[PDB]
Amino acid sequence: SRQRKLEALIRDPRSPINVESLLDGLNSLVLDLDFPALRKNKNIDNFLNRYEKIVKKIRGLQMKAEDYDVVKVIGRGAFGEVQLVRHKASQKVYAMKLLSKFEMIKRSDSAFFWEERDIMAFANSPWVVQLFCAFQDDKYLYMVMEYMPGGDLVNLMSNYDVPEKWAKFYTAEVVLALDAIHSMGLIHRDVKPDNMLLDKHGHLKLADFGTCMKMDETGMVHCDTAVGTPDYISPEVLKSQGGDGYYGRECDWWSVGVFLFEMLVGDTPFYADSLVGTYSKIMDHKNSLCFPEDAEISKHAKNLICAFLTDREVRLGRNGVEEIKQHPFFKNDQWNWDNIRETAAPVVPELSSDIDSSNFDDIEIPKAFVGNQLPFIGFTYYR
Amino acid sequence: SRQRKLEALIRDPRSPINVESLLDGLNSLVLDLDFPALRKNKNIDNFLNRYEKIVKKIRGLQMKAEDYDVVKVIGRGAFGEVQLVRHKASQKVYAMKLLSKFEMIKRSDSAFFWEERDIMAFANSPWVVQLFCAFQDDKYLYMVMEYMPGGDLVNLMSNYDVPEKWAKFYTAEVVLALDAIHSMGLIHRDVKPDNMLLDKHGHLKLADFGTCMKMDETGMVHCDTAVGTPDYISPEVLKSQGGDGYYGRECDWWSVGVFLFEMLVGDTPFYADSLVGTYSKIMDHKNSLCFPEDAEISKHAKNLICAFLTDREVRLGRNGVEEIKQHPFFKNDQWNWDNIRETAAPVVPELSSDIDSSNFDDIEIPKAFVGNQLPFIGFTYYR
Ligand SMILES: C[C@@H](N)[C@H]1CC[C@H](C(=O)Nc2ccncc2)CC1
Numbered sequence: 001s002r003q004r005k006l007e008a009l010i011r012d013p014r015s016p017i018n019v020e021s022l023l024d025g026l027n028s029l030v031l032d033l034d035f036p037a038l039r040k041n042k043n044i045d046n047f048l049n050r051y052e053k054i055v056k057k058i059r060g061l062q063m064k065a066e067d068y069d070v071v072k073v074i075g076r077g078a079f080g081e082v083q084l085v086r087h088k089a090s091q092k093v094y095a096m097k098l099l100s101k102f103e104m105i106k107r108s109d110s111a112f113f114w115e116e117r118d119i120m121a122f123a124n125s126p127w128v129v130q131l132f133c134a135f136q137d138d139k140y141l142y143m144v145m146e147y148m149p150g151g152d153l154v155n156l157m158s159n160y161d162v163p164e165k166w167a168k169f170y171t172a173e174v175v176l177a178l179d180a181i182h183s184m185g186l187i188h189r190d191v192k193p194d195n196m197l198l199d200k201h202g203h204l205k206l207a208d209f210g211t212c213m214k215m216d217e218t219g220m221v222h223c224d225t226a227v228g229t230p231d232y233i234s235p236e237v238l239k240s241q242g243g244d245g246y247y248g249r250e251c252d253w254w255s256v257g258v259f260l261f262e263m264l265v266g267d268t269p270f271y272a273d274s275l276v277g278t279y280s281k282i283m284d285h286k287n288s289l290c291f292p293e294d295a296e297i298s299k300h301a302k303n304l305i306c307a308f309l310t311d312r313e314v315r316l317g318r319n320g321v322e323e324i325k326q327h328p329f330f331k332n333d334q335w336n337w338d339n340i341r342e343t344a345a346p347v348v349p350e351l352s353s354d355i356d357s358s359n360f361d362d363i364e365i366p367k368a369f370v371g372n373q374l375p376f377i378g379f380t381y382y383r
Numbered sequence: 384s385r386q387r388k389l390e391a392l393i394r395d396p397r398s399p400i401n402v403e404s405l406l407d408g409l410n411s412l413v414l415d416l417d418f419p420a421l422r423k424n425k426n427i428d429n430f431l432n433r434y435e436k437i438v439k440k441i442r443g444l445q446m447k448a449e450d451y452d453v454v455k456v457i458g459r460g461a462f463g464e465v466q467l468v469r470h471k472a473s474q475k476v477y478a479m480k481l482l483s484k485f486e487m488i489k490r491s492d493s494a495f496f497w498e499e500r501d502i503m504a505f506a507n508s509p510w511v512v513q514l515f516c517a518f519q520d521d522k523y524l525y526m527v528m529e530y531m532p533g534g535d536l537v538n539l540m541s542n543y544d545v546p547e548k549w550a551k552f553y554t555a556e557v558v559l560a561l562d563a564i565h566s567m568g569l570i571h572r573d574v575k576p577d578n579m580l581l582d583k584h585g586h587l588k589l590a591d592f593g594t595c596m597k598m599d600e601t602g603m604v605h606c607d608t609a610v611g612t613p614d615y616i617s618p619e620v621l622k623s624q625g626g627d628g629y630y631g632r633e634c635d636w637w638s639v640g641v642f643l644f645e646m647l648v649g650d651t652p653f654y655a656d657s658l659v660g661t662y663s664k665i666m667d668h669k670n671s672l673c674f675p676e677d678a679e680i681s682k683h684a685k686n687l688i689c690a691f692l693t694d695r696e697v698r699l700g701r702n703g704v705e706e707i708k709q710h711p712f713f714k715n716d717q718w719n720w721d722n723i724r725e726t727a728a729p730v731v732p733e734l735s736s737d738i739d740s741s742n743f744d745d746i747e748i749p750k751a752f753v754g755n756q757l758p759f760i761g762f763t764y765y766r
Pocket residue numbers: 074075079082095097129145146147148149194195197207208
């Protein structure tokens with residue numbers, strides 16, 4: 001019937017008008033209307049006094065910050081915050097992200113939580129940190145995700161001399177995770193060690209997605225903003241900043257190269273004091289790139305890095321991931337391309353409790369109807 | 384769980400935030416926002432282009448004027464319209480009311496469809512025409528209700544000499560229907576033959592409710608507008624027009640009196656050429672009321688009429704319906720107060736098809752965010 005067809009969409013968690021959508025819908029409309037200012041308008045007042053009561057009972061029944069306990073903040077910065085939390089009822093342990101709504105739109109034109117949400121909600125991939133539920137309130141987005149007790153790659157690199165045996169591993173894992181995202185029609189565009197976390201067993205997942213983007217039917221994207229961390233940006237993306245940016249996934253392979261280099265050499269290949277110095281060097285890569293003579297690297301590890309750090313037109317992986325997978329550097333004995341996430345991780349976390357956070361550092365009205373909650377509608381996500 | 388408690392309300396057809404509410408919610412928000420004018424606002428545009436597509440598929444799946452065929456208009460006037468319709472899929476026959484949204488609020492401050500809706504939706508009473516579903520579109524409310532093939536009492540009276548045997552019957556039926564409404568905490572306030580229809584078997588239901596009102600915990604209402612048909616208004620309601628109106632249900636019994644009189648005498652007891660003449664007479668009832676000498680009425684039929692047409696302070700039924708039920712006028716042989724709607728109606732309709740309509744007559748952008756659909760949210764009603 002027409003009637004079932006409806007109930008389909010309202011339930012489908014991938015539908016833009018499932019229950020949460022609507023409840024977000026109604027809920028934001030309250031917020032964006034409830035001011036002595038526009039309550040002057042006839043309609044607006046009546047309406048608000050009607051739903052008034054019920055909306056409070058609802059606000060109480062839904063998911064709430066309160067449903068959780070903060071074990072401690074394990075990541076703060078220019079974004080919002082990550083806290084180790086304990087679900088009060090389930091007694092269980094999660095990582096929760098807090099995003100400033102205020103920031104989120106008004107400043108960030110290019111931090112699409114939308115993309116992020118869907119990915120963590122529905123990637124259903126061993127390569128992608130997973131989102132168990134999302135909710136908002138007036139100020140905040142909240143993302144409840146698997147606690148990754150291993151810490152990030154920055155932290156890891158920060159603590160060890162990474163031999164190549166190790167590096168092979170992390171690189172491979174990154175490549176797999178990236179190809180995941182790619183083959184989901186997305187370009188990641190922000191491949192940095194800070195976005196790579198390790199689970200309980202010391203295997204990798206990608207944990208941020210705020211900058212991903214659906215590709216052309218040709219595999220390309222059209223873009224005019226540069227995005228990412230200065231140190232890791234590709235030339236093409238750097239250039240896209242000047243309007244008329246057109247590039248594919250191979251920009252993610254660029255960053256991989258950097259990553260490898262940083263992992264093997266313990267510095268990033270285009271370090272400078274200015275960001276422009278950095279940029280300068282990135283554009284000048286053909287001359288700016290090279291290896292300290294005391295760095296102990298294999299020739300293969302050098303080819304691969306070099307095969308990555310070049311212009312899209314020649315860069316490795318423009319022919320897809322298989323030629324990457326096939327580079328000599330990867331020949332090894334502990335794993336192959338199919339079993340790797342089953343093999344022994346090179347650094348195994350030893351976690352004494354389910355809240356052991358040793359791998360992280362300690363931290364330190366309108367006039368018009370404006371309608372600010374609109375973009376947050378359909379964010380709340382359940383199960 | 385908290386989680387089930389939710390799904391309760393979203394399903395409960397009596398909840399102000401069941402699915403239709405929300406879908407009305409989302410839907411009206413589109414309409415009240417989709418203008419080149421405010422699409423200038425950042426939020427408003429983005430939002431609208433998002434839901435854009437999905438809302439069209441929905442608009443198609445829901446209940447639509449189109450789902451029905453118009454057999455013919457059987458009532459038009461200062462309200463909107465009633466049409467005999469055939470549900471296309473079920474092949475079945477209903478009466479459908481059309482209300483101008485434009486009118487509905489902007490002019491009418493006192494035509495609470497809300498009250499009407501709930502009554503016909505949920506009275507679930509043999510005395511109350513029944514509502515099978517309600518839907519809106521941009522212009523209109525639509526009410527799908529049982530076709531009452533008998534026509535109204537105005538029509539009936541218009542066609543026969545009503546003997547008292549008959550009158551006893553219709554009055555009794557009215558009294559029962561009224562007491563129904565009352566004992567649902569409501570005062571009807573617009574008792575007129577035009578609001579009394581007859582079903583297939585020639586029994587009565589009340590078909591309009593736009594003027595009903597929840598009573599005090601004391602059984603009273605506070606009111607400052609007069610409502611009803613000039614000919615039938617009670618003194619107290621007429622006076623309420625002057626601010627400080629305070630009265631109970633016994634104002635509905637006033638109108639009953641009129642009704643009886645009109646039925647027995649074939650004219651209304653306070654007829655004049657002006658409305659004020661009428662009003663004059665109504666206030667002057669103590670002297671203005673009396674019976675033409677050629678009118679053939681029983682003494683009992685006169686007491687009762689007179690017992691009704693007096694000031695609330697003394698009027699019959701201020702002590703509840705039982706003293707009415709007990710008036711001698713009602714002594715009869717065909718029915719008692721409990722079986723009446725099972726007994727033989729005095730005028731039995733003879734309807735040759737399921738669309739025989741012989742008992743009816745032939746008929747002949749904003750600037751600000753204004754928010755006009757708000758008051759219509761939660762009107763759509765299903766099953
Ligand atoms: C650098 C930013 N793009 C961003 C990287 C991911 C990080 C995170 O989600 N952390 C996390 C998740 C789960 N468990 C532990 C940490 C927060 C900040």
